[PDB]
Design a protein around this ligand. Structure first.
Ligand code: NDP
Ligand code: NDP
Lengths: 390, 394
């Protein structure tokens, strides 16, 4: 039972504590550690942090070197977020969070525990096929070693990127941001299981006096103006799927789409508030969308789409899968546990405390309308992922 | 559930029968239809048939033009050290899709094929262990249905059908004999097993209706016993590279089966030209079982270090390893999908067959199954190292 190994992992080592660590900095941030800079959200996080702060962003990246900066640079460039002015703000740090001490020597880790003022832990292995064991190192031990730095030499505030996937599916009443964490058993998939464990670890460090914010994004999607978006995204995969065979599923679940520019603005905004310490926030769209509505938006852009019950739609996918290898790659994702006629289940959240904490900021989630979809679709079209609607 | 789809599908359409078709050739074969000439066994089949008959081999191949299909065929055999340019005039490439009605031919092309072809070796099939039954319904079931339609169109054509030992129930007290009929659908795991089960049900119905058919159930088919030739996309090649790469292997209960392709090829051709074979079913599997630890000993002997762990613990370390390793992750997907009974301590179950009826049929042919030993495994690994699939040892 995987649950037996999760519980054991959710225990934080006794020596991960404030102990005799010097107090957190009270002035402005001078140096920040960000993980996941070569990823989707990390890119907009990195760029947002350069804009809203004057701190040097230390970016932990997997690479063979000065090769880290190029990975970072390329990543931001793929989203239209890079300028040369960013280069001096960014300090790549060669590492691997799936290793002890983030893959640094004892000597390098000690130096880091002295230079870093605050931590934005965004890095994680996101994979919807792999079992728990696959993501144990990066997600569980990665977070454990983050807490180890956060408490080493001098206290460092931790802004932790978690997911709403830590909450049980198949629930009518949205989940409030203050409700405590449930059993490990209520969870499906190795990713959710790993993030569940990680958040347990973080909550333990918080209860032990480390200054921590917990941010649970929902389904994060493209930048609402430029439409910049990760095409390796399952949502993106699924979109091409339906397009290319001209049929979409009916699902009774309410759909959440949170543009990444909101999510990243929100993270920075909430991280800058002393009131956020100890708090959890659901960074999801305040406004939910229905299945058929997104289909309407997509027809309007020009793509034809027959609408089928989810079940009958997976069947057609199965058949088509024997045709395309990309369509098959998507079939593997959808062929697990949620396959019935009303679609897959998915969590529903309240974002009350978030909307409240952000009411005084210029940070508002974009609304999901036909205009946003067109921004997204046009982007995928112009970038070659999709063929232009006839 | 899918067994209900399976059962509906195992029903051979009414019109697929003998009726007014001219009887089968009784003279020498003039033309042969071979499916799957771009695949592994088909390459060896094609070479056996070319060597052992004087017929022209019509190879149904997926391509944009005929000359591309010929190039596809050509390249395949060469990858196995099977090609020879004397074979070119022997081969008649045939553009089509066995997952399409009439194999992807027009009514006119289909009628003309139904006039030319004297016998059918149906070896083409979608072999995929991740996809569901619905993904392989087209090639395996309706593909087989359409071949049976060809075999009964205009004039009768004997069919030699490559099935698989995987249509057989797993975990049974006795090695399944070639004589026992098919069990129900419910006890087959995986879309692949399920589509082949359906396909064999179809072929047996046609048989019952009087179509001359041979049913040939290969076991796990492996590299050529002398050259060591083998297709790397193979799940057994896949698995072996894994264990090598991560320096550990699982200890399993199951008796393993290894059948070199050159024995399968030859036995299929052999049995097919025996008139005693019609209506009969044969199990082309290695008569001698090998054990897990035996196999690990042969590869250590070749030079590869291998720790031995229990399947579940080996499977767990595979999980850990797949974090950074796409191809490791890829392999992990195959094994995680197997039902709990075959993901346990002793590892995956696997079927055990008898090949008595095959031995007698292949009394004196010079055709027998090579043995599994360090020597065979050395031939196998040298090839893969040479092909560059494997890094050499030490
Ligand atoms: N809709 C969404 O995408 C959601 C995201 N989140 C969370 O946001 C965070 C970012 O997700 P997202 O941007 O979408 O995913 P990405 O896969 O695009 O980015 C993952 C980042 O994590 C890095 N990473 C993974 N493993 C390691 C490792 N062992 N060592 C160092 N770096 C590593 C990756 O570096 P590398 O390039 O080397 O792989 C990459 O930069 C994650 O924690 C995710 O769980 C939460 C809810 C929803
Ligand atoms: N260990 C083994 O290999 C065993 C194999 N078998 C059976 O042997 C036969 C072939 O096995 P194997 O050689 O290993 O597999 P391969 O995948 O190597 O060969 C598959 C062959 O089938 C062709 N094929 C698949 N789909 C189509 C299609 N829609 N139209 C035309 N051709 C198609 C392929 O052509 P293309 O290249 O264009 O895809 C290819 O020529 C199968 O019937 C299999 O069930 C049975 C037991 C064991």
């Amino acid at each position: 039972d995987v649950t037996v190994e999760m519980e054991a992992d959710a225990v934080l080592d006794a020596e991960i504590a404030l102990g005799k660590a010097l107090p957190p900095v009270t002035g402005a941030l001078r140096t920040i550690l960000l993980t996941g800079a070569t990823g989707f959200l990390g890119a907009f996080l990195l760029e947002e942090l350069c804009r809203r702060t004057d701190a040097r962003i230390y970016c932990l990246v997997r690479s063979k070197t000065q090769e880290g900066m190029n990975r970072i640079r390329k990543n931001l460039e793929s989203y239209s977020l890079w300028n040369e002015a960013l280069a001096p703000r960014i300090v790549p740090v060669r590492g691997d969070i799936g290793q002890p001490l983030l893959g640094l020597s004892e000597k390098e880790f000690q130096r880091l525990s002295e230079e870093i003022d605050a931590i934005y832990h965004n890095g994680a292995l996101v994979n919807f096929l792999y079992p728990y064991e696959s993501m144990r190192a990066a997600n569980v031990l990665g977070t454990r070693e983050i807490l180890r730095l956060a408490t080493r030499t001098r206290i460092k505030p931790l802004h932790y990127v978690s997911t709403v996937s830590v909450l049980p599916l198949g629930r009518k009443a949205p989940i409030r941001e203050d409700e405590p964490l449930e059993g490990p058993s209520s969870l499906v998939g190795g990713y959710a299981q790993s993030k569940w464990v990680a958040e347990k670890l973080v909550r333990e460090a918080s209860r032990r006096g480390l200054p921590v914010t917990i941010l649970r994004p929902g389904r994060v999607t493209g930048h609402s103006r430029t439409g910049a978006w990760n095409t390796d995204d399952l949502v993106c995969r699924t979109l091409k799927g339906c397009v290319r065979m001209g049929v979409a599923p009916s699902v009774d679940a309410l759909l959440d789409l949170t543009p990444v520019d909101y999510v990243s603005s929100a993270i920075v905004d909430l991280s800058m508030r002393p009131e956020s310490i100890g708090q959890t926030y659901h960074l999801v769209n305040p406004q939910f969308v229905r299945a058929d509505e997104m289909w309407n938006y997509m027809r309007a852009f020009g793509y034809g789409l027959r609408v089928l019950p989810y079940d009958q739609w997976l069947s057609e996918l199965g058949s088509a899968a024997s045709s395309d290898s990309e369509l098959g790659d998507l079939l593997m994702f959808l062929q697990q546990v949620d396959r019935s006629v009303g679609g897959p289940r998915m969590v529903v959240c309240d974002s009350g405390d978030t909307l409240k904490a952000l009411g005084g900021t210029g940070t508002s989630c974009p609304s999901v309308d036909a205009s946003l979809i067109s921004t997204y679709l046009s982007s995928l079209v112009h970038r070659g992922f999709l063929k232009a609607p006839e």
